[PDB]
Amino acid sequence: GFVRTLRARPEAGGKVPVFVFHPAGGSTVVYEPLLGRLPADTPMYGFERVEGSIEERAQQYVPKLIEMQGDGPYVLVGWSLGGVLAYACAIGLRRLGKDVRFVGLIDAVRAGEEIPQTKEEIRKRWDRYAAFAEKTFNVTIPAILEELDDEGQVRFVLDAVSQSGVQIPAGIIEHQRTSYLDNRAIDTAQIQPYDGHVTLYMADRYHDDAIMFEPRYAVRQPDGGWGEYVSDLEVVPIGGEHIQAIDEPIIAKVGEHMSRALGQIEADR
Ligand SMILES: COCC1(CN(C)C(=O)c2ccc(CCn3cc(-c4ccc(-c5cc(OC)ccc5OC)nc4)nn3)cc2)CC1
């Protein structure tokens, strides 16, 4: 399946499980530091990669979420891509009349300026990713005319790396491939409004490689773009860079706040 047990719930009773969603190019094992900062015996299950648009991924996740937790309450948490997935699941659960009590977005932040949706921006986008690959693997990707699938675009870059002579591990290449595709899913997402409570854990800025990939991550709005879609939004400053938000020491601030939120939920069952 696509569900990873990070801490199993007791056979009966116990606390409300926390559902976490994978980041681009990684597994839900990244949430182990967070789990360390949550109360003892807090169950946590991780939702791993599935294919399609954000909406289509949520369509696969939501039935499984319901199978596991039923009417609720639902606690949905995600860093980076995982935050977008958690949000989409929040929409789906809410449409099915489920009790969603917490949505935790760990620095899942929209580009601070409008991204052009033109033919020319497709070329520029690709060029930036190629430049990222070049620096990452110290190789020269040849010039790419390129009207083909997202899969085909990343494959051109990664095929160029392997054919260059250099020997990158297969796992590193594969994570690079899925990372690219997941980020494409983010940018083609059609984000819907949500009337529930959303907690945005807000870092200071995006890391350099994110900005290299998409320049408009250089700027971010105070609300991370979510205010438009969420009338009940709580922004919690955590400082640091996007990439550091998931680890110690920054994750302590997330876990402290989240622990109090979970405490309140337990008092209403
Ligand atoms: C792992 O990737 C490796 C890769 C790229 N690279 C080298 C990186 O370093 C890299 C780049 C980017 C990211 C993603 C960070 N992120 C963005 C968001 C987000 C949330 C929401 C909306 C959003 C979007 C909307 O429609 C477009 C509308 C509203 C909306 O929000 C209110 N947009 C965006 N969440 N996390 C992570 C790492 C080589 C591939």
Author numbering: 1454 to 1597, 1602 to 1726
Extract from the study:
The cocrystal with X20403 solved at 2.0 Å resolution demonstrated a similar binding pose as X20404. Interestingly, the cyclopropyl group induced a shift of the α-helix formed by residues Lys1572-Lys1588, pulling the C-terminus of the helix closer to the inhibitor by 5.5 Å, as measured at the C-alpha of Phe1585. An additional H-bond was observed between the terminal methoxy O2 of the compound and ND2 of Asn1640. The side chains of Tyr1582 and Phe1585 are within VDW distance to C39 of the cyclopropyl group. Likely due to this gross change in the overall structure of the protein, crystals obtained for the X20403 complex packed differently, and the structure was solved in the P2221 space group, containing two protein molecules in the asymmetric unit, each bound to an inhibitor.
Pks13 is a multidomain enzyme that performs the final step in the synthesis of mycolic acids through the condensation of a long-chain fatty acid (C24–C26) and a very long-chain fatty acid (C56).12 The product is transferred from Pks13 to trehalose by the Pks13-TE domain. Pks13-TE is a validated target for the development of antibiotics for Mtb. In previous work, we identified TAM16, a potent lead molecule for Pks13-TE. X-ray crystallography verified that compounds from all three different series were binding deep within the active site of Pks13-TE, displacing the side chain of Arg1563 with atoms within about 4 Å from the catalytic Ser1533 OG.
